[PDB]
Amino acid sequence: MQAIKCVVVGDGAVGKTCLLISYTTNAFPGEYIPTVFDNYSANVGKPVNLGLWDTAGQEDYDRLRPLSYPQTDVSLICFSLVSPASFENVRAKWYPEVRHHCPNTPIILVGTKLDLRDDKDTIEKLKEKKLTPITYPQGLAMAKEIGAVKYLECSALTQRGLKTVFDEAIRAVLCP
Amino acid sequence: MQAIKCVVVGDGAVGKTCLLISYTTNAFPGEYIPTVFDNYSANVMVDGKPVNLGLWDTAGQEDYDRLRPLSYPQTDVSLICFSLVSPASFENVRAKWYPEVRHHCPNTPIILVGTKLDLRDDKDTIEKLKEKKLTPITYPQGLAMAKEIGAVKYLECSALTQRGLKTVFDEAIRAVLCP
Amino acid sequence: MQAIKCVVVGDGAVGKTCLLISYTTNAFPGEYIPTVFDNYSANVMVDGPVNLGLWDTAGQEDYDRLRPLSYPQTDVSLICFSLVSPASFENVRAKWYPEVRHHCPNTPIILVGTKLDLRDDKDTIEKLKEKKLTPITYPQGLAMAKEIGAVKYLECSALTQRGLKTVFDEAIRAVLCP
Ligand SMILES: Nc1nc2c(ncn2[C@@H]2O[C@H](COP(=O)(O)OP(=O)(O)O)[C@@H](O)[C@H]2O)c(=O)[nH]1
Ligand SMILES: Nc1nc2c(ncn2[C@@H]2O[C@H](COP(=O)(O)OP(=O)(O)O)[C@@H](O)[C@H]2O)c(=O)[nH]1
Ligand SMILES: Nc1nc2c(ncn2[C@@H]2O[C@H](COP(=O)(O)OP(=O)(O)O)[C@@H](O)[C@H]2O)c(=O)[nH]1
Ligand SMILES: [Zn+2]
Ligand SMILES: [Zn+2]
Ligand SMILES: [Zn+2]
Ligand SMILES: [Zn+2]
Ligand SMILES: [Zn+2]
Ligand SMILES: [Zn+2]
Ligand SMILES: [Zn+2]
Ligand SMILES: [Zn+2]
């Protein structure tokens, strides 16, 4: 059994909690959603226990220090594919955070809310603000920029790509 | 979108946790009840614009709670809860909970919430209270206590049957958005 | 109504969280299990009213910022070990009994053997034999309970719901009827 600690980081409202709830319980939350999902684990794969940690705000101001204690093995940096602000924060904030608190450990870059990237209403609302969803090549390029071992897109709502995210988190630690 | 932090305070066993679980999940708990419901939030639309309503349950007195839920981060509105069928919980609104909110959340609105409305005018809860020379708290008494502590509203509800529950949280938002 | 604080302690992976989930919800968890079930209580009638508060734990008390064994005061503790992990059984004497004695002196202990469903699962017994191990027997468990001064020894399975209700019934009785 190899234990692994996987922490999910990123801006508020990108879908970190929903990612974890959908994957761990196969249910998508209702309108009231936990702010921070509790720590869960599974024994999966080869012999592996995958420990999953949700986060609140920036590590430095979180009394629980989920990114630092105990030691993190792999980080999922999440941004919403329909929030360009949240993508820019990968570079401004989240890659710096993981490098600072978890130096020399693998990062997976995860674009969330894949289902909304072709949602008519979502695209229109963005267009009204002179914005457009983040594309696959853009995400891939950000992943290369920050030294992420994988770029993955998913929807917690439809579960498209969701299983691959957590399989790759494990592979990043087991098969570096 | 304005974020609103709403904290639920009051004596043990008044129904704070059940108030939150019933509202957020539309189910009333079974035999085993969490002591303190985790933090949940919702994106709500109120007369035009998006609000995120964050709900916090509490354990005991703030000063001895290492989590300090009433203080961190800053609370926008407090629900002081007492059970309509526990006069002692009601007296503690004046002895404990109003002083607590005034101390830790100065100059923020209070809603006074009478819980367990489904028991107030009965099951023969009335007869069991009478054995002890006690009587359920009446609406006028609750209203008077709300005035005394400067609460912006007094509301009665049942988590069990959901009587009046949605109004509690609608009014909590309105107290912050419409001071 | 008497409030009772019951804390569940023992090695990682013995089945503490599952014990608590299965009992309180009558169903065994999926592949994804909370590391530490949140604090729950129930109002229960035993003989002539009790509130039984249940606390799950993580690692050793002294390094757990939450200090569940110490704060507030514990009335009874369940020391758990897996019937198919001899190492976890040895840690009853090396670790868990000393922990409860240090942080909760002069309070009752119930010793609980978990994963009773495996004590005869061939995949498990054979794999144990390969490592020169054998599942813990009832007499061994009983002897350890005597050694550590536990007021009861109980065996259970969260997976099948064998013996679960008895664990919590006896937890109550240990405080109510000392
Ligand atoms: N359409 C869609 N909405 C999502 C998805 N994941 C999260 N959301 C919504 O995005 C908002 C924030 O989700 P949450 O998981 O609480 O984000 P967090 O702050 O990063 O934890 C909520 O309104 C969710 O319902 C998704 O995959 N698809
Ligand atoms: N009849 C009735 N009982 C309730 C109601 N809400 C809570 N309770 C019960 O009151 C007890 C305490 O509830 P809880 O929510 O845990 O109280 P807290 O300590 O204030 O969180 C439990 O036995 C609940 O079942 C209600 O609306 N009606
Ligand atoms: N076969 C069997 N497995 C169990 C039982 N209880 C827990 N487990 C498994 O043992 C592992 C650890 O359980 P958990 O409750 O998380 O252990 P804890 O670390 O002590 O809380 C998980 O793989 C569970 O599915 C049981 O009664 N029987
Ligand atoms: Zn969240
Ligand atoms: Zn930092
Ligand atoms: Zn438009
Ligand atoms: Zn509660
Ligand atoms: Zn929790
Ligand atoms: Zn105070
Ligand atoms: Zn556990
Ligand atoms: Zn210790």
Which residue's CA is minimally distant from atom 28 of ligand 3?
C115
Using a CB-CB cut-off of 8 Å, the residues of chain A touching C32 are: 23-25, 40-42, 52
Residue A32 assigned to a binding site: yes
CB-count exposure of residue A76 (10 Å: 0-12, 13-18, 19+)? buried
- Domain ranges, residue B73: 1-179
The resolution in Å comes to: 1.9
Interface contacts (A, B; CB < 8 Å): 26
Phi-psi region of B150 (alpha: psi -120 to 50; beta: other; left: phi over 0): left
User: Is the N-terminal amide bond of B73 cis, ω within 30° of 0?
Assistant: yes
Residue A92 CB-half CA count within 13 A: 9
Using a CB-CB cut-off of 8 Å, the residues of chain A touching C21 are: none
| CB nearest C34 (choices: A38, A43, A44) | A38
With beta carbons less than 8 A apart as the criterion, state whether B137 and B120 touch: yes
H helical segments located in B26-116 = 87-92, 98-104
> Structure tokens of C10?
């023992």
Method by which this entry was solved: X-ray
- Smallest CA-to-CA distance from C6 within C60, C49, C42 is with C42
With beta carbons less than 8 A apart as the criterion, state whether A111 and A151 touch: yes
CB-count exposure of residue B122 (10 Å: 0-12, 13-18, 19+)? exposed
> Structure tokens of B58?
């509490």
Bridge partners, B110 (sequence order): B78
Q: To test the ligand 2 pocket, which listed residue (B22, B32, B33) has its Cβ within 8 A of the most ligand atoms?
A: B33
Using a CB-CB cut-off of 8 Å, the residues of chain C touching A40 are: 32-35
Chains that touch A (3 or more CB pairs under 8 A): B, C
Tell how strand A150-153 and strand B49-56 pair up.
unpaired
CA of A12 to the centre of ligand 4 (A): 7
Domain count, chain B: 1
Q: To test the ligand 3 pocket, which listed residue (C17, C32, C33, C122) has its Cβ within 8 A of the most ligand atoms?
A: C33
Tell me whether A33 touches chain C (CB under 8 Å): no
CA of B47 to the centre of ligand 1 (A): 23
Min Cα–Cα distance to chain C from B169, Å? 25
> Structure tokens of B61?
């007195």
Q: Which of B7, B23, B38, B46 to mutate to test the interface with A (most CBs of A within 10 A)?
A: B38
User: Is the N-terminal amide bond of C72 cis, ω within 30° of 0?
Assistant: yes
Q: Which of C23, C26, C40, C52 to mutate to test the interface with B (most CBs of B within 10 A)?
A: C40
- Smallest CA-to-CA distance from C176 within C47, C58, C15 is with C47
For Cα atoms B28, B115, B14, give the angle at the middle one, nearest 5 degrees.
80
Q: What is the rounded CA–CA span in Å between residue A99 and residue B91?
A: 54
CATH number of the domain that residue C91 is part of: 3.40.50.300
What's at B59, amino acid-wise?
A: A
Q: What is the rounded CA–CA span in Å between residue B75 and residue A70?
A: 30
Using a CB-CB cut-off of 8 Å, the residues of chain A touching B25 are: 30, 32
SS3 for A105-152 is CCEEEEEECHHHCCCHHHHHHHHHCCCCCCCHHHHHHHHHHCCCCEEE
Tell me whether C35 touches chain B (CB under 8 Å): no
For Cα atoms B132, B130, C3, give the angle at the middle one, nearest 5 degrees.
45
Min Cα–Cα distance to chain B from A56, Å? 11
**Would the CB of C119 count as within 6 Å of ligand 3?**
no
CA of A39 to the centre of ligand 8 (A): 8
In chain C, DSSP assigns E strands to 2-10, 33-34, 40-44, 50-55, 76-82, 109-114, 152-155
